[PDB]
Amino acid sequence: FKNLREFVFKNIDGYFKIYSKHTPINLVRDLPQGFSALEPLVDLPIGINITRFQTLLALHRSYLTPAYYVGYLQP
Amino acid sequence: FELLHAPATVCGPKKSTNLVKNKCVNFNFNGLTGTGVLTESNKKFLPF
Numbered sequence A: 001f002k003n004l005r006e007f008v009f010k011n012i013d014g015y016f017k018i019y020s021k022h023t024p025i026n027l028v029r030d031l032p033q034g035f036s037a038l039e040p041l042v043d044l045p046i047g048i049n050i051t052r053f054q055t056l057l058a059l060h061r062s063y064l065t066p067a068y069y070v071g072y073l074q075p
Numbered sequence B: 001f002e003l004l005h006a007p008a009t010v011c012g013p014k015k016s017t018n019l020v021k022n023k024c025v026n027f028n029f030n031g032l033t034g035t036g037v038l039t040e041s042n043k044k045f046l047p048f
Helices: none
Strands: A004-012 A015-023 A039-044 B025-029 B032-036
Touching: none
Parallel strands: none
Antiparallel strands: A004 A015, A015 A039, B025 B032
């Protein structure tokens, strides 16, 4: 698959921005050694203090019971 | 209206003058003030 998508979430001083990209890659299992510069998408001014977050997936079976990377930051 | 610790979202400007070009005058570009000769540039900028 020649499709790599990367997203960046930040939450500072009441401003919310999202940095996104689509790019083609060709490697068997994980990220290649190539380099490129990400671009911002949209600025959101609500600025809610976010502590816990969840993602979404696509699936068919409605079994309701009541590959993504995540890293930390240093200033 | 409220003045709590939050970014300002709603306010409206008013039309004052018309566009000017190629003469060194002061300008207010998105809150940035400066004075210079405006000359068309051939450099390609990033969309953001």
